[PDB]
C-alpha cells in the first residue's frame, strides 16, 4: 500500500529519552520510516522551545492534503541547519523514537510510505 493508517503516541518533549533518529538527513528519514512501520515512533507537537530540546537532523510529519477515516494524510520532511529535504503542508509535529514514554494523546495519520 502507498498509504498506511497509523495512530502516533504524542509525547511531551521533556519525557523523550531518544531525541532524534540519527546523524544525516538520509539516516533520520530511513530510521523514521522503519520506526513508523514497526510501531516504535512518537510525535512531539512543535511549540516555542521544543526544537532546541531535540537533536538535528529533525524529521517532520507535514499535512500532504486537505482526512480519510479521521486520519490526516502526511508525508516526511527532514531539516538540518535550516534546510528542509522535501516540500509539504503544515507541520503536525516532529517524529522521535518511542521507547515506552507515556503519551498525552494519539494523532491518527495516513502516512504516504
Rounded-to-integer distance, Cα 68 and Cα 48, Å = 30
CATH number of the CATH domain containing 82: 2.30.30
Rounded-to-integer distance, Cα 29 and Cα 112, Å = 13
Domain span at residue 17?
3-112
Instruction: Please return the burial class of 42, using the count of CB atoms within 10 Å of its CB with bins 0-12, 13-18 and 19+.
Output: buried
- Give break positions in the chain: residue before each, C–N beyond 2.5 Å: 66
CB-based contact 78:25 (threshold 8 Å) = yes
Rounded-to-integer distance, Cα 30 and Cα 89, Å = 21
Domain count, the chain: 1
CB-based contact 85:29 (threshold 8 Å) = yes
Cell numbers describing residue 49: 522551545
Q: For residue 71, which phi and psi values (nearest 5 degrees)? A: -80, 110
Map residue 79 onto helix, strand or coil. Answer: strand
Amino acid at each position: 500500500k502507498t498509504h498506511v493508517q497509523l495512530s502516533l503516541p504524542v509525547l511531551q518533549v521533556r519525557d523523550v529519552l531518544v531525541r532524534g533518529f540519527g546523524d544525516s538527513v538520509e539516516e533520520v528519514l530511513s530510521e523514521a520510516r522503519q520506526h513508523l512501520k514497526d510501531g516504535t515512533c512518537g510525535l512531539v507537537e512543535v511549540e516555542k522551545g521544543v526544537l532546541p530540546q531535540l537533536e538535528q537532523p529533525y524529521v517532520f510529519i507535514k499535512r500532504s492534503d486537505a482526512a480519510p477515516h479521521g486520519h490526516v494524510m502526511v508525508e516526511l520532511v527532514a531539516e538540518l541547519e535550516g534546510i528542509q529535504y522535501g516540500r509539504s503542508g503544515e507541520t503536525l509535529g516532529v517524529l522521535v523514537p518511542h521507547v515506552g514514554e507515556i503519551p498525552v494523546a494519539y494523532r491518527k495519520v495516513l502516512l504516504r510510505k
